[PDB]
Amino acid sequence: PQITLWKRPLVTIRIGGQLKEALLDTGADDTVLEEMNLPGKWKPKMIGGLGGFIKVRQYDQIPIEICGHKVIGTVLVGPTPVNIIGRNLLTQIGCTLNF
Amino acid sequence: PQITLWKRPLVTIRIGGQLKEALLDTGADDTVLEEMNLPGKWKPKMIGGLGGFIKVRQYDQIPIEICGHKVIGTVLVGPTPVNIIGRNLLTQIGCTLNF
Ligand SMILES: CC(C)CN(C[C@@H](O)[C@H](Cc1ccccc1)NC(=O)O[C@H]1CCOC1)S(=O)(=O)c1ccc(N)cc1
CA distance B34 to A54: 21
CATH number at residue A57: 2.40.70.10
Pairing mode of beta strands B10-15, B52-66: antiparallel
Report the candidate in A14, A68, A8 with the shortest Cα–Cα distance to residue A36: A14
Q: Where are the alpha helices (DSSP H) in B1-99?
A: 87-90
CB of B66 within 8 A of CB of B9? Answer: no
Residue A99, beta-bridge partner list? none
Report the candidate in B20, B93, B81, B66 with the shortest Cα–Cα distance to residue A53: B81
For residues B38, B66, A67, A85, the Cα torsion angle rounded to the nearest 10 degrees is -50
Q: Tell me which residue range forms the domain holding B73.
A: 1-99
> Pick the catalytic residue: A25, A29, A30, A60?
A25
CA distance B67 to A35: 38
Active-site residue, A25 included: yes
Q: Flag whether residue B51 sits within 8 Å of chain A, measured between CB atoms.
A: yes
Other C-beta atoms within 10 Å of A79: how many? 12
Query: Resolution limit in angstroms?
Result: 2.2
For B78, phi then psi, to 5°, come to 180, -160
Coil/strand/helix, residue B55 = strand
Radius of gyration of chain A from Cα atoms?
Answer: 13
CA distance A5 to A2: 10
For A3, phi then psi, to 5°, come to -120, 125
Q: End-to-end alpha-carbon separation of chain B, Å?
A: 15
Q: Which of B8, B11, B50 to mutate to test the pocket of ligand 1 (most atoms within 8 A of CB)?
A: B50
CA distance B93 to A62: 35
Q: Flag whether residue B81 sits within 8 Å of chain A, measured between CB atoms.
A: yes
CB of B87 within 8 A of CB of A5? Answer: yes
By CB atoms closer than 10 A (0-12, 13-18, 19+), residue B39 is: exposed
Q: Cβ(A40) to ligand 1 under 6 A?
A: no
> CB under 8 Å, gap of 24 or more: what pairs does A68-72 form?
A69/A93, A69/B99
- Give the rounded distance of the alpha carbon of B89 from its chain centre: 7
Count of domains in chain A?
A: 1
